[PDB]
Symmetry: D4
Subunit: 159 residues, 8 copies
Amino acid sequence: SAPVVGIIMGSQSDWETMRHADALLTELEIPHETLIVSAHRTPDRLADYARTAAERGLNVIIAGAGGAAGLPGMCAAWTRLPVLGVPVESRALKGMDSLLSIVQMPGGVPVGTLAIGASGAKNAALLAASILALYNPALAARLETWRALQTASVPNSPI
Amino acid sequence: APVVGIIMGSQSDWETMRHADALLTELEIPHETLIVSAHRTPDRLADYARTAAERGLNVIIAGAGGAAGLPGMCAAWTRLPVLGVPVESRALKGMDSLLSIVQMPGGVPVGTLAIGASGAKNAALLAASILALYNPALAARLETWRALQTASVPNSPITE
Amino acid sequence: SAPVVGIIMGSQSDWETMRHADALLTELEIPHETLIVSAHRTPDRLADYARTAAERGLNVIIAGAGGAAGLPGMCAAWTRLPVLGVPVESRALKGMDSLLSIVQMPGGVPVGTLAIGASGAKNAALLAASILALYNPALAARLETWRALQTASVPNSPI
Amino acid sequence: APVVGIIMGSQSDWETMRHADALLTELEIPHETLIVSAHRTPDRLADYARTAAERGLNVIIAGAGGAAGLPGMCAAWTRLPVLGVPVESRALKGMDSLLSIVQMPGGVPVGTLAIGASGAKNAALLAASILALYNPALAARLETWRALQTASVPNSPITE
Amino acid sequence: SAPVVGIIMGSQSDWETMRHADALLTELEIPHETLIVSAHRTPDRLADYARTAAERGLNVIIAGAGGAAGLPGMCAAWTRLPVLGVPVESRALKGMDSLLSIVQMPGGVPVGTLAIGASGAKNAALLAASILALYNPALAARLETWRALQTASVPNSPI
Amino acid sequence: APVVGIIMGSQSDWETMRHADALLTELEIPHETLIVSAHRTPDRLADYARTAAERGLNVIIAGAGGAAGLPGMCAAWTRLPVLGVPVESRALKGMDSLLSIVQMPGGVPVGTLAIGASGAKNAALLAASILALYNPALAARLETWRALQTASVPNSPITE
Amino acid sequence: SAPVVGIIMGSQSDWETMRHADALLTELEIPHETLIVSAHRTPDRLADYARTAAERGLNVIIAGAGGAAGLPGMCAAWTRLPVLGVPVESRALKGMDSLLSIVQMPGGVPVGTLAIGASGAKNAALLAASILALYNPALAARLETWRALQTASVPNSPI
Amino acid sequence: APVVGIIMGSQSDWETMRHADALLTELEIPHETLIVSAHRTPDRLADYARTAAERGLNVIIAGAGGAAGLPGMCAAWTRLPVLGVPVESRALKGMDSLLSIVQMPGGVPVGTLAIGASGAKNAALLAASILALYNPALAARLETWRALQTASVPNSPITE
């Protein structure tokens, strides 16, 4: 019932991308919360969210943002929990700025980065699932089924 | 018994991956370090990745330069979380390494870290934070490590 | 009758691009098979496909994929046959990620890479044709005709 | 009392940021130079940026390499103008630094300068031009400095 | 009444982007002028504009241009006033050329550069506002209110 | 009699192309190595490419740096498969070389390999795999070479 | 009457871009020819065109192509005349491949390169005009008028 | 009397621009070489570019690194053809130089050459080919130079 994964994003504009992470966690029945937390516009909200995440029972945080995406990095700065970052595609630079702003974290504060866009949001949720599966047998079985179905469902020839 | 597996495409990757090895040892996390080439020893990778979970591994840290493809293929065969470290390449300075690792299609994740030594160290720290979720002793050591890092940052530069 | 060229792609989404390779081989009457084989979602299917390709009579493999396109490289890892790679255009990075993930193969396992997109798929088929033409006189003549017609058909002035 | 604050993520950034320090001193602009890590000392940054205005600072010059994120987060907490200096990185030569600093979302500005030493010097000059708007003495010194720069450019290269 | 901020752009095509800077200054009630001044097509107009800016009472200049955007740099070359540059998104290179042509100013002549596009235009105006606020108490209070409202208005969850 | 032609724009390309030469010799594949400049000796290239097939060549390996354009123009004149090797350039590290070679328009193919030495070696290996399709003896030597490469990969890095 | 400028392009697809060079030369009343000459598909046609250009009275050649654009460089390889290159925007890489393939000519064989796209085609024609103006007084006056009108026509404020 | 003007932003550009100077002298083309900074000496540039035609110059070769903007602004003030040479920059290896020079808006052309020494040499050769259009003696010298370049290309690399 209590969320074990927190999905946060810099703004409503990131939802089109982050909704894919939400859908995947729901699919695997992983309790989670989905919120908007801006490192740049609501820094104190982020500070509070990140430093109290562990105490609240969260195990993994999935953070998405575009452009000079400082959200994932700053979230990781305040929590000891694993932080996964999703580079949201930006209008001009197609997420290259988002990607470098998230993945190039200096040594000492990590952010596990996924692909730019929807695929990355989906994979952040799957990566979070694989993490939780390490100590949740039931979920591990559901993840195995998910991966197995993915593999078995790939067509043999194009239509 | 190892709970983290550090794999790389060749000896040339060790200069970078040794930083992940050192950090895990520092946090007292048992691990194994191997060379597994996705392109030169594809069957070795298949076997390694396929059996990782049953062998007791919880996290795999894979390093690759250029288009080596090691992290992605490891993730294709294991249900375990796979972290990728882009090893700096001669011509493209790791940009090819980075894109070839992070741009995984939806369905097969690879948590990617920064290009080079920083990425290797952070891959180990990320692995540590994952393991700490269910290992109180490690969680305490990680907390101490993170707190020390914060307390050790100087307040002013040596402007001499 | 038996296929001598195998066209494989990571997913149905790659078909819009790889269909150009299919059309060209058919045009030159080169027997081939067209399949979906995902290195990431169906690794064992790829292992089987690539290691048995030569035994099955295939002479050249054309592999297309986008993003962190590991398909061409892994196919080349399991077969001694020439592997040609087609970088499929990706949404965000326009195939630059596809290109680097295919062309930057470390020494020891080659992948002959073509241009990003439809042009690359067409050229992979033409390159495969030029390879087969080295030991198939009839096909060599048809390829000569194809190249000759291409050259002769270029307009002298724009419309 | 300092009117400009120069902050950077680590001692490694000093090689670049010292150029901003030198220029401010040259123009007789009182300032402070500190190391504040957005990722390693987030609360130190929060406090620094939040209290900058009340402490008398008018402009903040922040340097960062890679994805350090220092300039952006400083700007998030202060109403003061924040100038960012992309510090050259090993692999991507400051391109990651540049994009991570300049591409701020609408609503939270960071005036960004060139990658490296030139950017640090220009950040100080930009800060100087801002302060000169309400400091006649400084305005005169800046005018003299700009005029001297122009008058000092050689007319021909030493072609020997 | 007299303008204290000058917004200049290379051409009418830049207006779609620079209008965001105009709107923000008006919102904060900052007197300003908005003009088209091309460094490449009207060099003498730029020379006159920039060298006389200070005398006319301007305190900050916001310059926007795309491609080989020389406007911001040349404006800064002629004035002692702070010059802020806005990289306008270009058709082919998505503003990467605009960005490098503005931000990479050699030491000695600065241009405070903002993000590519509309966000950059808005932020140039906000940065100009933060500069003027240093010596204008009333404006400083309005800027505080603007920043406070921005922070308070961020939703807590996506729709 | 040569069955593979290795051509390059200048002596400066040899440092890279020599790797293709060495690999072909290792696999006992007769070949010729020449300097042919698309831009400085356009007619030499026209003649070389036009007559390659009648001279007995089966595959051409062309190396070029920057915008040299050698691989593409060779392919324009020959019906033979042409493989391109991007030679690393000083400023753009071979990125200009790579794009100028791989982005051929539909209708005129150039099978492109990696930037630098790895690409040169792989161009030779690719040429070898093409020739092996109709040369049993070579096919056996290639099989042995590939198998040896796989068997020679170390299982663990020298972590000393 | 006889053409003094030759505009050549790799294919009909380049016309949308190169037509801007054609329009400008016509505007300035500069006799010219506009043809399709493909370095890759019609190499011999290019060889003949370029080596005989000077003999035919051409003074400047404007060559446009996209992707691995070898047309400008190869044209310059066969003629002593000044060759100006126009990078045509490519689908995937937005002309970055076109640009590098044209501008990065090794020392010894130059190609004066213009901007990617329509602007580049227009400027190639203007650059050709400025070259011809050096020894054609009447044209020099028309070019002066063209440049003067361009400068005088720039609006002072956006609409 | 000079017919070509070679201008650059600073002494640091000379290492690159000297190649244009040498080539013009080789072809016996009278020219002048000056340092003119678009950003540091804007009025010097205005005067230089504005009066170039009346002073007898037929072509201007301008070199710039980063965002110096010299070629574009020179072209803004002169009706003469302006050729631009991107000088290699420290961090971005001339990519910033290249884009800042070649991406001129329609209406104000700058014929751009390759990044670095090759571009400087080619700018001089391009200027030479322009002048040769109305100078028979020079046309003959250029023809001889181009023919010699072609005849001097070696047929095979020194494979020792």
